[PDB]
Amino acid sequence: GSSGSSGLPNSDHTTSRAMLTSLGLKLGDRVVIAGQKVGTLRFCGTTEFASGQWAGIELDEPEGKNNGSVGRVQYFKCAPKYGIFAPLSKISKLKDSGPSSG
Known part of the structure; x- marks a missing residue:
């Protein structure tokens, strides 16, 4: 770990x-x-x-x-050029999306 x-x-x-x-x-x-x-x-x-x-x-x-892992740290397993990371706050449930008006 790292204190400071x-x-x-x-x-x-x-x-x-x-x-x-x-x-x-x-x-x-x-x-x-x-x-x-x-x-x-x-x-x-x-x-x-x-x-x-x-x-x-x-x-x-x-x-x-990515391919499931990022550099030295590993998260999940998957094929090459398949795994990706995105802001949870930016990631929501499928469907039920559509501003329309803007």
């Missing part, structure tokens, strides 16, 4: 409990990144490369900028 870098203890303090229930997503559900990209939710929480709430989604087609 980010802040507050590690492991503990997880914000991945009051998000899945509030939003309505779970491991094994079809989500949508920004109501555009369609993928299957596999991992949900924080990332090691970036900062904030993310999720390791797995697109059905080869349109991802």
